[PDB]
Amino acid sequence: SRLPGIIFILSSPRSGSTLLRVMLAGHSSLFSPPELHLLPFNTMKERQEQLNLSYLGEGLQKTFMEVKNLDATASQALIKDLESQNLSIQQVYGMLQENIAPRLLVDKSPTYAMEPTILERGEALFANSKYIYLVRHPYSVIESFVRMRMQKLVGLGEENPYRVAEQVWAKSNQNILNFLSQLEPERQHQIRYEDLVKKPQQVLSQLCDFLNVPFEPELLQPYQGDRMTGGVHAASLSISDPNFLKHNTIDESLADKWKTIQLPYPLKSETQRIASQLSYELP
Ligand SMILES: Nc1ncnc2c1ncn2[C@@H]1O[C@H](COP(=O)(O)O)[C@@H](OP(=O)(O)O)[C@H]1O
Ligand SMILES: [Cl-]
Ligand SMILES: [Cl-]
Ligand SMILES: [Cl-]
Numbered sequence: 001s002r003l004p005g006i007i008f009i010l011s012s013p014r015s016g017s018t019l020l021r022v023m024l025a026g027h028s029s030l031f032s033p034p035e036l037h038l039l040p041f042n043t044m045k046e047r048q049e050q051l052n053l054s055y056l057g058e059g060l061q062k063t064f065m066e067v068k069n070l071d072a073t074a075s076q077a078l079i080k081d082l083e084s085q086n087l088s089i090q091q092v093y094g095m096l097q098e099n100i101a102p103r104l105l106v107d108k109s110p111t112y113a114m115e116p117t118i119l120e121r122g123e124a125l126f127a128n129s130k131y132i133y134l135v136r137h138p139y140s141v142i143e144s145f146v147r148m149r150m151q152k153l154v155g156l157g158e159e160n161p162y163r164v165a166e167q168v169w170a171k172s173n174q175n176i177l178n179f180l181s182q183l184e185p186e187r188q189h190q191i192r193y194e195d196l197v198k199k200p201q202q203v204l205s206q207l208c209d210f211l212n213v214p215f216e217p218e219l220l221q222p223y224q225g226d227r228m229t230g231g232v233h234a235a236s237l238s239i240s241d242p243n244f245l246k247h248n249t250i251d252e253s254l255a256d257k258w259k260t261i262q263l264p265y266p267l268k269s270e271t272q273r274i275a276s277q278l279s280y281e282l283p
């Protein structure tokens with residue numbers, strides 16, 4: 001039997017997903033943690049055995065700390081107990097839902113879009129979830145991915161970094177497009193990164209209407225309060241650094257970077273078609 005629906009943020013890497021999840025973390029109706037790394041796995045033992053991350057990836061540990069007012073050691077002890085009994089991932093999600101209730105979980109990870117079977121698992125575990133599809137211009141994503149030296153994470157450190165980055169953007173976006181094409185229009189909402197940082201009030205107000213929550217001022221203040229970004233920096237990171245703490249406001253200047261970014265190669269024809277579908281211009 002499926003769990004009550006949650007909210008997913010789906011995106012390519014480097015699309016401002018962390019910024020968005022942190023904005024939403026401020027809303028009293030929502031609970032929006034660093035990556036939980038639950039969705040890709042069937043059981044907690046599978047997760048423990050297979051979950052290897054460049055940084056500490058303590059989203060789940062931090063979640064139990066917040067919702068149960070626990071120190072790090074006690075939260076870890078709880079997670080180890082779930083692993084020892086080998087709870088299903090659905091059982092752990094159910095436990096999270098009860099511990100955050102009446103708040104709704106916001107589940108964000110750019111890695112979900114890399115595997116169509118992971119996207120499908122969301123629909124298998126949950127009923128009537130809502131999907132926020134966050135998109136960013138391919139030039140901006142590619143420049144960032146290459147700058148951050150993420151090519152190794154794909155298992156393609158021997159190929160051209162720019163082409164590897166392009167493939168990540170193209171595959172993630174095509175996978176999301178394919179997945180969402182099968183779902184009710186009423187359960188999906190697109191956000192463009194460029195709009196998010198240039199017009200956050202308008203974007204967030206429209207998102208609030210989609211989520212059926214009222215607007216709260218905290219949405220516009222991602223650097224205020226406890227939004228699970230504090231303490232040891234490496235603890236909220238998983239696959240790379242979103243560079244959220246290298247800024248101190250919603251920084252609009254990062255939107256238009258695509259207007260001047262010079263990539264070594266024109267995007268492949270297939271990538272250009274995806275960009276066209278998403279209404280991005282390619283200078
Ligand atoms: N406060 C802020 N304002 C605007 N954009 C931000 C931001 N913090 C992070 N970002 C953008 O989000 C990107 C990371 O996205 P994600 O969280 O999906 O990995 C960053 O990549 P760069 O710092 O490499 O430019 C940056 O462009
Ligand atoms: Cl990323
Ligand atoms: Cl991320
Ligand atoms: Cl994940």
Ligand SMILES: [Cl-]
Nearest residue numbers: 037038040051
């Ligand atoms: Cl994972």
Ligand SMILES: [Cl-]
Nearest residue numbers: 056232234235
């Ligand atoms: Cl730590």
Ligand SMILES: [Cl-]
Nearest residue numbers: 239240241242
């Ligand atoms: Cl990141």
Ligand SMILES: [Cl-]
Nearest residue numbers: 243244245246
């Ligand atoms: Cl940072």
Ligand SMILES: [Cl-]
Nearest residue numbers: 242243244245
């Ligand atoms: Cl950060």
Ligand SMILES: [Cl-]
Nearest residue numbers: 247248249251
């Ligand atoms: Cl800034």
Ligand SMILES: [Zn+2]
Nearest residue numbers: 035037109111
């Ligand atoms: Zn993960």
Ligand SMILES: [Zn+2]
Nearest residue numbers: 056058072235
């Ligand atoms: Zn720690």
Ligand SMILES: [Zn+2]
Nearest residue numbers: 013014240242
């Ligand atoms: Zn990221």
Ligand SMILES: [Zn+2]
Nearest residue numbers: 241243244245
């Ligand atoms: Zn950082």
Ligand SMILES: [Zn+2]
Nearest residue numbers: 246247248251
């Ligand atoms: Zn800045």
